């Protein structure tokens, strides 16, 4: 069988999987039965992605297709964004997955910039302008094939190719930013279909660790964290490699490269997720220079040594 | 032993601007000087030029703003920069800019944000913003660029990023996608860089793998042509297999029927060429990929494409 490995980054050359951002840091959290069940940054250690998990750090919380409706009067968000896949391919929702792959995973508002370059008339004229898509609005319905989003421009047209880039997200007031609560794919009154299952550790001692990011914020004071359970490169590692998982647990190693002491030792669950032994809210204190590195897979009984 | 991921058109990342490839595209031979500074790279793995491993670091900034030069320059907010990374900006180092600065002539549009350290912790503020490559402030090989902001809403001494989203045509301010900025500002030559890129072989063309960005007004087709996809120079890096000889010979192929496509020539260098005449945008289906075939010498003659 091909070997398990993971890509040799840095912190720093690492991109978090539910948001375009660097990784910033690595927290380890205490417990308190929090559902994590993010849809982004999902891939099993033999290369299957999950939830809304794609490829590019391009298509994380980014929307593509066309707007159809100006809505005004009847919505604040006011234009409505009928949605293609991120590739362009036309979206089908009766496909077995939460919502189009890309779709952001969190509750509370996406600040980006949509834009467009028409197709017809005038050909290759453009517009962008900062806009914002609540998660929360009757509007997103993503799984139903479309979101709208607000903008203070009114300079938008509509049936000409529109794409939404995210930046960051935006704190107002009733419209706080919870990154746990996944947002109603369909709408409200509607729950959530195809997801992939909530994680937590098993095994008394040990919490999650996550890739942490800062990402930006329009506004409302916010330290702007997502955490991720696997970054974005390592996605895309596994998926190339597709090696296949010989336990249930890898056992991965921190290391120094220059010293060549391993910092701490971590399990990486074949469902792709990590946890560490440690008791409390950890940010953790690792040299720059430093990464994971695959050991050896390990049985169900395996204690890890306290981090 | 050398390889090229497998991704299709789709799952490919520009390396010159954050955005999905579109298309693939050879382009006629005239005399262009095809030196881009992102998207830089070996295929033993060395990244050159300004050339990071991100795609969050393309095109992006990172610093503070130590000074409000309104007035005085239409890009009134002057950025020291650090490195994407957060640690200090060096001057000295044998590079062109610091990593992950534009390599064309024109303005990028994107945002900048802000959240505070220090005075009013955690509070936050995010607006469009624009960065002119042909301003007299766009010095990144000096530690600064400035933007401007229809916005008046930043403050000096906090910690700021810029986030490219696309670019934006403006009277007296023309795209040149292959034209270096001055990384020194003004009446400055820039040094460090990754070498010009041509072929040279009769009857080939450079291959680009085409992006069309967003554009915040003006008529533009938003094209912006890199020599390797931002996946494989990640690839290359974690690979670094040795090279062989100067050419990698590579096949496109339909994984589907196994049929190859075409064949092309991947150079140590890190670039493709093609044997075709004129430019033309390939058709291509969805689901093909290139794949390494064999070391071969520069003077390999190419099937017709």
């Known amino acids: 069988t091909k070997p398990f490995s993971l890509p040799i980054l840095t912190i720093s050359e690492l991109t978090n999987s539910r948001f375009p951002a660097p990784i910033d840091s690595l927290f380890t959290a205490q417990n308190n039965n929090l559902n994590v069940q993010c849809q982004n940054g999902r ?87 900062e806009a914002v898509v609540s998660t929360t609005s009757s509007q997103f319905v993503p799984k139903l094939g479309s979101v709208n989003f607000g903008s203070t421009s009114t300079d938008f047209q509509l049936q000409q190719p529109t794409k939404f880039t995210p930046v960051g997200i935006k704190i107002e007031s009733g419209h706080e930013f919870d990154q746990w609560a996944l947002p109603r794919y369909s709408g409200h009154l509607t729950l959530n279909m195809n997801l992939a299952p909530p994680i937590a550790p098993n095994f008394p001692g040990e919490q999650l660790l996550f890739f942490r990011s800062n990402v930006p914020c ?71 220079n430093g990464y994971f590195r695959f050991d050896s897979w390990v049985n169900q009984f395996y204690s890890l040594a306290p981090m």
């Open 43 to 129: 891939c099993t250690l033999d290369g299957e992605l999950q939830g809304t998990t794609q490829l590019l750090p391009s298509g994380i919380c980014a929307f593509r297709g066309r707007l159809t409706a100006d809505v005004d009067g009847s919505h604040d968000d006011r234009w409505h964004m009928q949605l293609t896949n991120l590739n362009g391919t036309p979206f089908d929702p009766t496909e077995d997955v939460p919502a189009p792959l890309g779709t952001p995973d969190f509750t509370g508002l996406l600040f980006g910039v949509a834009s467009q370059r028409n197709v017809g008339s005038n050909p290759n004229t453009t517009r962008a302008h």
């Open 218 to 288: 329009a506004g409302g004071v916010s330290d702007g964290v997502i955490d991720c359970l696997l970054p974005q490169e390592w996605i895309q590692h596994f998926y190339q490699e597709s090696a296949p998982s010989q336990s249930d647990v890898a056992l991965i190693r921190y290391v120094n490269p220059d010293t060549g002491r391993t910092l701490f030792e971590a399990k990486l669950h074949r469902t792709g997720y990590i946890t560490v032994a440690h008791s409390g809210d950890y940010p953790l204190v690792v040299p720059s």
